[PDB]
Design a protein around this ligand. Structure first.
Ligand SMILES: C=C(C)[C@H]1CN[C@H](C(=O)O)[C@H]1CC(=O)O
Length: 258
């Protein structure tokens, strides 16, 4: 009957419509992932309910209890049937849930306040005037923590014990710190979010340098789910038709402010 979809609020993937208080159910939300969910549902022929993950996390396994949290945990423990969000495809997550082909490509990137004399990862790792950090949890932080590359190992060694903490807890926090640090803070985040903010007033940030890696976001389903196959074929079809690009351009540029 009704497929239970777990997601999370993160602009411009899933946001509350300005008039949401007057709306109900699925109609309350808007965004790239909201449009994507509708497309996938239409293609696979299923009815569904969008729900916001309880703990507001993406997916990580606690080191003490070995229990998965976030949307990944909702799928592993049978709370939701599918997760449609900017959920990064990682080896650790791939071990416990299934991912469709990526619906969007991305790579860890650098966000600076316009005017900052930083152009790449090497630049940051060499100086100390301009501080830099990542989210206090998530795929990006983990990338630096386990990296074997000298430059990235150098950046992690710094970020690891920098004071005050160069880590932020949300994308908005990371952005504000950049906008408010007078060019003394660089925020390491996923290129997709970076490109998005760049099109947001007061248009004072920008992405610099190439991406530190290459990955993608995928629609996740619990392992053995008889939904996984259909969802993957739907993603492939929407991508072949150019709809995913059109969708990205819609929420990133057509609705841009800069
Ligand atoms: C917005 C958050 C916390 C997410 C989105 N994708 C990543 C993930 O799925 O881990 C996290 C970003 C990052 O790690 O920089």
């Amino acid at each position: 009957k009704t497929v239970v979809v777990t997601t999370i609020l993160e602009s411009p993937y899933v946001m509350m419509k300005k008039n949401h208080e007057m709306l109900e159910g699925n109609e309350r939300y808007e965004g790239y992932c909201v449009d994507l969910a509708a497309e996938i549902a239409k293609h696979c022929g299923f009815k569904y309910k969008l729900t916001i993950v309880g703990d507001g996390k993406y997916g990580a396994r606690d080191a003490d209890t070995k229990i998965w949290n976030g949307m990944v945990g909702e799928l592993v423990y049978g709370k939701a049937d599918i997760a449609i969000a900017p959920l990064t495809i990682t080896l650790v997550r791939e071990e416990v849930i299934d991912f469709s082909k990526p619906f969007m490509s991305l790579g860890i990137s650098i966000m600076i306040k316009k005017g900052t004399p930083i152009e790449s990862a090497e630049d940051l790792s060499k100086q100390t005037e301009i501080a830099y950090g990542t989210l206090d949890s998530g795929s990006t932080k983990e990338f630096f923590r386990r990296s074997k590359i000298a430059v990235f190992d150098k950046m992690w060694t710094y970020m690891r014990s920098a004071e005050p903490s160069v880590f932020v807890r949300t994308t908005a926090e990371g952005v504000a710190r950049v906008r408010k640090s007078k060019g003394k803070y660089a925020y390491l985040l996923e290129s997709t979010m970076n490109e998005y903010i760049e099109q947001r007033k007061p248009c004072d940030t920008m992405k610099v340098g190439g991406n530190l890696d290459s990955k993608g976001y995928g629609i996740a389903t619990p392992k053995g789910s008889s939904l996984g196959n259909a969802v993957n074929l739907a993603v492939l079809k929407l991508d072949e038709q150019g709809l995913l690009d059109k969708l990205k351009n819609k929420w990133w540029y057509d609705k841009g402010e800069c």
